[PDB]
Design an enzyme around this catalytic site. Structure first.
Site, mmCIF file in Angstrom:
data_model
loop_
_atom_site.group_PDB
_atom_site.id
_atom_site.type_symbol
_atom_site.label_atom_id
_atom_site.label_comp_id
_atom_site.label_asym_id
_atom_site.label_seq_id
_atom_site.Cartn_x
_atom_site.Cartn_y
_atom_site.Cartn_z
ATOM 1 N N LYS A 232 1.909 4.727 -0.921
ATOM 2 C CA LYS A 232 1.324 5.926 -1.501
ATOM 3 C C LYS A 232 1.562 7.069 -0.519
ATOM 4 O O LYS A 232 1.823 6.819 0.652
ATOM 5 C CB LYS A 232 -0.173 5.744 -1.766
ATOM 6 C CG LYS A 232 -0.979 5.343 -0.550
ATOM 7 C CD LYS A 232 -2.443 5.160 -0.901
ATOM 8 C CE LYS A 232 -3.246 4.755 0.291
ATOM 9 N NZ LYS A 232 -4.667 4.616 -0.099
ATOM 10 N N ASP B 220 -0.167 2.243 8.129
ATOM 11 C CA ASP B 220 -1.201 1.484 7.444
ATOM 12 C C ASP B 220 -0.654 0.199 6.849
ATOM 13 O O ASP B 220 -0.332 0.116 5.659
ATOM 14 C CB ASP B 220 -1.969 2.303 6.416
ATOM 15 C CG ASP B 220 -3.302 1.669 6.081
ATOM 16 O OD1 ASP B 220 -4.173 2.336 5.486
ATOM 17 O OD2 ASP B 220 -3.476 0.482 6.436
ATOM 18 N N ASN C 126 0.176 7.309 3.175
ATOM 19 C CA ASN C 126 0.611 6.348 4.173
ATOM 20 C C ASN C 126 1.982 6.649 4.726
ATOM 21 O O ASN C 126 2.503 5.859 5.518
ATOM 22 C CB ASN C 126 0.545 4.931 3.615
ATOM 23 C CG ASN C 126 -0.868 4.415 3.537
ATOM 24 O OD1 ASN C 126 -1.796 5.000 4.108
ATOM 25 N ND2 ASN C 126 -1.043 3.296 2.861
ATOM 26 N N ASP D 98 0.816 -1.206 0.000
ATOM 27 C CA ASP D 98 0.000 0.000 0.000
ATOM 28 C C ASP D 98 0.853 1.260 0.000
ATOM 29 O O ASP D 98 0.494 2.268 0.623
ATOM 30 C CB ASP D 98 -0.992 0.013 1.165
ATOM 31 C CG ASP D 98 -2.241 0.816 0.864
ATOM 32 O OD1 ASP D 98 -2.933 1.162 1.830
ATOM 33 O OD2 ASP D 98 -2.520 1.112 -0.327
ATOM 34 N N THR E 240 -4.081 0.581 -4.068
ATOM 35 C CA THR E 240 -4.754 1.772 -4.543
ATOM 36 C C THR E 240 -4.518 1.900 -6.047
ATOM 37 O O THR E 240 -3.392 1.689 -6.493
ATOM 38 C CB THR E 240 -4.177 2.997 -3.823
ATOM 39 O OG1 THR E 240 -4.307 2.822 -2.404
ATOM 40 C CG2 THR E 240 -4.894 4.259 -4.255
#
Ligand SMILES: NC(=O)c1cccnc1
Length: 340
Positions: A158, A174, A161, A156, A191
């Site tokens: 991005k 996260d 985060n 994840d 995502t």
């Protein structure tokens, strides 16, 4: 690699495995804390600023609704998230301080990082210079070297985060999609803008997806927008699988070269997934100015320090409707979450 790195990672894995095999459980309870403010909200949970009533320390408390976790098919993911977080230890990973559950919710109590998300800072200043982007990228490279050596995939990456701390360094948060994987895994998660082609195409994929996501992140930090952008997810996915990326003319040649090798659609040719592993990235000319040890030791002066007034300041987070933390009189989903 240098025996120093090999021995470091061997100790890192030893310490992770001991905690992985015997996870901590039930180390606080809700009424030990005062609720201060909602810092973020999602489809099955929220993150709250709380204050411990006896010590006065501030924490970020992630609260997951067990019934919604079940409905959205996130059971294994939430168990992964907590089991991994309680077992890891690295300078750029958020620290889990307590966890517990009650009749309704799962709780993870972590250090509160008042500087906010990289996303906010990036959108505020537009784009980061290459040195600034490189400082953050180096931390992610080292963090993925650590995680991947433990057989962990993060899944994840991005800007939202990545929290910016009081020294201007990154804290990755996260772990909702992080997973211990030897070999391949198959879940569609992440995502859209950051998904590797092999996720989109429903293949059995591996840690190479994290290195693809690093390419997306570096591009986004340096350009101000991600490389594959569109109004509908399906249009994003068409661009991702196409094997075509356009670079702003302000990008250096070294940056473009690195990004072509991270944003390589053929996972068997992607930097981070070759025989030389992470060293193809660490030795790339774009990182020639990076002192990897100094970054790890947090001895490099950061590009900027977020503005904040103290450990309880919430100014770098935004405003959300304040909703109840309700705890049912009856236990929900006890069996599903036994190990939490
Ligand atoms: N650990 C976290 O998720 C977090 C979130 C927001 C602020 N500080 C910490």
């Amino acid at each position: 690699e240098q025996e120093s790195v090999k021995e470091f990672l061997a100790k890192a894995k030893e310490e992770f495995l001991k905690k992985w095999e015997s996870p901590s459980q039930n180390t606080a309870q809700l009424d030990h804390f005062d609720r201060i403010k909602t810092l973020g909200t999602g489809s099955f949970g929220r993150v709250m600023l709380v204050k411990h009533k006896e010590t006065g320390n501030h924490y970020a408390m992630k609260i997951l609704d067990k019934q919604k976790v079940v409905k959205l098919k996130q059971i294994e993911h939430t168990l992964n998230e907590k089991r991994i977080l309680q077992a890891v230890n690295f300078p750029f990973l958020v620290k889990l301080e307590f966890s517990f559950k009650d009749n309704s919710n799962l709780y993870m109590v972590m250090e509160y990082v008042p500087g906010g998300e990289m996303f906010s800072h990036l959108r505020r200043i537009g784009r980061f210079s290459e040195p600034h982007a490189r400082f953050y990228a180096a931390q992610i490279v080292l963090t993925f070297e650590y995680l991947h050596s433990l057989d962990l995939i993060y899944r994840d990456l991005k800007p939202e985060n990545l929290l910016i701390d009081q020294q201007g360094y990154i804290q990755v948060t996260d772990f909702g999609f992080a997973k211990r994987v030897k070999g391949r895994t198959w879940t569609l998660c992440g995502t859209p803008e950051y998904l590797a082609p092999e996720i989109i195409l429903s293949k059995g994929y591996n840690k190479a997806v994290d290195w693809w996501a690093l390419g997306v992140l570096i591009y986004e930090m340096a350009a101000g927008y991600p490389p594959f952008f569109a109004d509908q997810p399906i249009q994003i996915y068409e661009k991702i699988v196409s094997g075509k990326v356009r670079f702003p003319s302000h990008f250096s040649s070294d940056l473009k070269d690195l990004l072509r090798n991270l944003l390589q659609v053929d996972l068997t040719k992607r930097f981070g997934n070759l025989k030389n592993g992470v060293n193809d990235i660490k030795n790339h000319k774009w990182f020639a100015t990076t002192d990897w040890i100094a970054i790890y030791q947090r001895k490099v002066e950061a590009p900027f320090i977020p503005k904040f007034k103290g450990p309880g300041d919430t100014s770098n987070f935004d405003d959300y409707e304040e909703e109840e933390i309700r705890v049912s009189i009856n236990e929900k989903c006890g069996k599903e979450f036994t190990e939490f």
